[PDB]
Amino acid sequence: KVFGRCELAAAMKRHGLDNYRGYSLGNWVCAAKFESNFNTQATNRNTDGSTDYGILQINSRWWCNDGRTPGSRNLCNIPCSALLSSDITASVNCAKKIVSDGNGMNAWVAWRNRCKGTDVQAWIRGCRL
């Protein structure tokens, strides 16, 4: 499933992340354009020996189960590949929590320097709420 602009923006609020745990609507949308290019099928293996699964570029090493990454906490405890299906309905479970970790959104390489401080009100513009 390959998404459009206003095709990825509503279902975020449908799952409850609006201003979630102090994280608002302005901090989300920019990142997947820079981790998956609005794609759900972008699998890439980081030299850390782990791969980045899903549209969030998740490493099998810390949170999921891919079977080729030993010493992985597999903390989410689900198929490291279910994190790939068009139905994201379950993926963010690990999204809403990995933040409770306390070291922030700083779990991703791009938004941090590629998306932070950036005009975000603009990603939520041109669409309907």
mmCIF file of N, CA, C and O in Angstrom, residues 45-53 57-76 80 83:
data_model
loop_
_atom_site.group_PDB
_atom_site.id
_atom_site.type_symbol
_atom_site.label_atom_id
_atom_site.label_comp_id
_atom_site.label_asym_id
_atom_site.label_seq_id
_atom_site.Cartn_x
_atom_site.Cartn_y
_atom_site.Cartn_z
ATOM 1 N N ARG A 45 18.939 -2.544 5.552
ATOM 2 C CA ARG A 45 19.756 -3.083 6.631
ATOM 3 C C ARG A 45 20.892 -2.156 7.026
ATOM 4 O O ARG A 45 21.800 -1.885 6.229
ATOM 5 N N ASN A 46 20.855 -1.699 8.272
ATOM 6 C CA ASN A 46 21.890 -0.808 8.768
ATOM 7 C C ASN A 46 23.100 -1.642 9.145
ATOM 8 O O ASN A 46 22.943 -2.734 9.687
ATOM 9 N N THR A 47 24.294 -1.113 8.888
ATOM 10 C CA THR A 47 25.539 -1.839 9.116
ATOM 11 C C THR A 47 25.654 -2.386 10.536
ATOM 12 O O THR A 47 26.505 -3.234 10.810
ATOM 13 N N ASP A 48 24.796 -1.935 11.434
ATOM 14 C CA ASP A 48 24.823 -2.430 12.812
ATOM 15 C C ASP A 48 24.450 -3.913 12.859
ATOM 16 O O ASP A 48 24.442 -4.545 13.915
ATOM 17 N N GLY A 49 24.151 -4.445 11.682
ATOM 18 C CA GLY A 49 23.762 -5.828 11.480
ATOM 19 C C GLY A 49 22.263 -5.966 11.567
ATOM 20 O O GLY A 49 21.685 -7.002 11.229
ATOM 21 N N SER A 50 21.625 -4.902 11.987
ATOM 22 C CA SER A 50 20.198 -4.907 12.090
ATOM 23 C C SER A 50 19.645 -4.336 10.812
ATOM 24 O O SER A 50 20.382 -3.754 10.007
ATOM 25 N N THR A 51 18.371 -4.523 10.611
ATOM 26 C CA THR A 51 17.719 -3.975 9.454
ATOM 27 C C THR A 51 16.672 -2.990 9.946
ATOM 28 O O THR A 51 16.382 -2.931 11.150
ATOM 29 N N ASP A 52 16.135 -2.204 9.051
ATOM 30 C CA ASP A 52 15.095 -1.265 9.431
ATOM 31 C C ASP A 52 13.813 -1.715 8.775
ATOM 32 O O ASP A 52 13.670 -1.663 7.544
ATOM 33 N N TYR A 53 12.890 -2.159 9.600
ATOM 34 C CA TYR A 53 11.651 -2.731 9.124
ATOM 35 C C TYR A 53 10.502 -1.722 9.217
ATOM 36 O O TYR A 53 10.487 -0.865 10.103
ATOM 37 N N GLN A 57 11.426 2.500 9.747
ATOM 38 C CA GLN A 57 12.835 2.114 9.763
ATOM 39 C C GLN A 57 13.216 1.612 11.152
ATOM 40 O O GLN A 57 14.078 2.185 11.826
ATOM 41 N N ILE A 58 12.545 0.537 11.575
ATOM 42 C CA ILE A 58 12.777 -0.067 12.883
ATOM 43 C C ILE A 58 13.905 -1.095 12.839
ATOM 44 O O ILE A 58 14.010 -1.887 11.897
ATOM 45 N N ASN A 59 14.755 -1.080 13.869
ATOM 46 C CA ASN A 59 15.850 -2.018 13.915
ATOM 47 C C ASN A 59 15.396 -3.271 14.638
ATOM 48 O O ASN A 59 14.766 -3.219 15.688
ATOM 49 N N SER A 60 15.722 -4.382 14.080
ATOM 50 C CA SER A 60 15.343 -5.639 14.668
ATOM 51 C C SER A 60 16.070 -5.839 15.989
ATOM 52 O O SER A 60 15.615 -6.560 16.864
ATOM 53 N N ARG A 61 17.186 -5.147 16.114
ATOM 54 C CA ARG A 61 18.073 -5.239 17.246
ATOM 55 C C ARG A 61 17.454 -4.844 18.571
ATOM 56 O O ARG A 61 17.557 -5.599 19.536
ATOM 57 N N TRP A 62 16.810 -3.682 18.667
ATOM 58 C CA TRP A 62 16.285 -3.327 19.981
ATOM 59 C C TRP A 62 14.834 -3.727 20.230
ATOM 60 O O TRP A 62 14.527 -4.279 21.286
ATOM 61 N N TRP A 63 13.931 -3.462 19.285
ATOM 62 C CA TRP A 63 12.539 -3.666 19.598
ATOM 63 C C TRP A 63 11.823 -4.894 18.977
ATOM 64 O O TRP A 63 10.889 -5.402 19.601
ATOM 65 N N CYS A 64 12.215 -5.394 17.785
ATOM 66 C CA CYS A 64 11.461 -6.529 17.159
ATOM 67 C C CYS A 64 12.198 -7.893 17.076
ATOM 68 O O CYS A 64 13.290 -8.057 17.597
ATOM 69 N N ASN A 65 11.519 -8.879 16.411
ATOM 70 C CA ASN A 65 12.002 -10.260 16.164
ATOM 71 C C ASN A 65 12.212 -10.611 14.696
ATOM 72 O O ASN A 65 11.249 -10.956 14.016
ATOM 73 N N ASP A 66 13.449 -10.610 14.218
ATOM 74 C CA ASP A 66 13.699 -10.952 12.815
ATOM 75 C C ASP A 66 14.455 -12.277 12.630
ATOM 76 O O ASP A 66 14.568 -12.777 11.510
ATOM 77 N N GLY A 67 15.003 -12.803 13.713
ATOM 78 C CA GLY A 67 15.677 -14.094 13.745
ATOM 79 C C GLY A 67 17.114 -14.137 13.250
ATOM 80 O O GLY A 67 17.821 -15.125 13.446
ATOM 81 N N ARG A 68 17.563 -13.060 12.639
ATOM 82 C CA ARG A 68 18.927 -12.974 12.127
ATOM 83 C C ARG A 68 19.738 -11.978 12.953
ATOM 84 O O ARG A 68 20.908 -11.719 12.682
ATOM 85 N N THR A 69 19.077 -11.419 13.970
ATOM 86 C CA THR A 69 19.685 -10.460 14.870
ATOM 87 C C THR A 69 19.682 -10.989 16.308
ATOM 88 O O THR A 69 18.753 -10.715 17.069
ATOM 89 N N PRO A 70 20.720 -11.726 16.680
ATOM 90 C CA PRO A 70 20.843 -12.272 18.045
ATOM 91 C C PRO A 70 21.250 -11.190 19.025
ATOM 92 O O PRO A 70 21.897 -10.214 18.638
ATOM 93 N N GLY A 71 20.877 -11.343 20.291
ATOM 94 C CA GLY A 71 21.214 -10.319 21.278
ATOM 95 C C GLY A 71 20.212 -9.186 21.204
ATOM 96 O O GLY A 71 20.423 -8.097 21.749
ATOM 97 N N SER A 72 19.123 -9.457 20.497
ATOM 98 C CA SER A 72 18.041 -8.519 20.371
ATOM 99 C C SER A 72 17.095 -8.744 21.523
ATOM 100 O O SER A 72 16.790 -9.885 21.862
ATOM 101 N N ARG A 73 16.630 -7.665 22.122
ATOM 102 C CA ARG A 73 15.725 -7.775 23.246
ATOM 103 C C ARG A 73 14.361 -8.277 22.778
ATOM 104 O O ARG A 73 13.607 -8.844 23.564
ATOM 105 N N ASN A 74 14.045 -8.045 21.489
ATOM 106 C CA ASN A 74 12.772 -8.499 20.924
ATOM 107 C C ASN A 74 11.685 -8.058 21.857
ATOM 108 O O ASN A 74 10.688 -8.751 22.056
ATOM 109 N N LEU A 75 11.885 -6.888 22.401
ATOM 110 C CA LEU A 75 11.030 -6.355 23.419
ATOM 111 C C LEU A 75 9.576 -6.253 22.964
ATOM 112 O O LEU A 75 8.678 -6.607 23.717
ATOM 113 N N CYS A 76 9.319 -5.825 21.741
ATOM 114 C CA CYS A 76 7.922 -5.737 21.315
ATOM 115 C C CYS A 76 7.261 -7.100 21.397
ATOM 116 O O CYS A 76 6.110 -7.219 21.807
ATOM 117 N N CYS A 80 8.572 -9.216 13.427
ATOM 118 C CA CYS A 80 9.343 -8.018 13.107
ATOM 119 C C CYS A 80 8.898 -7.567 11.712
ATOM 120 O O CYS A 80 9.243 -6.496 11.243
ATOM 121 N N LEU A 83 5.183 -5.512 11.130
ATOM 122 C CA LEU A 83 5.490 -4.116 11.206
ATOM 123 C C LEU A 83 5.610 -3.556 9.798
ATOM 124 O O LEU A 83 5.966 -2.403 9.609
#
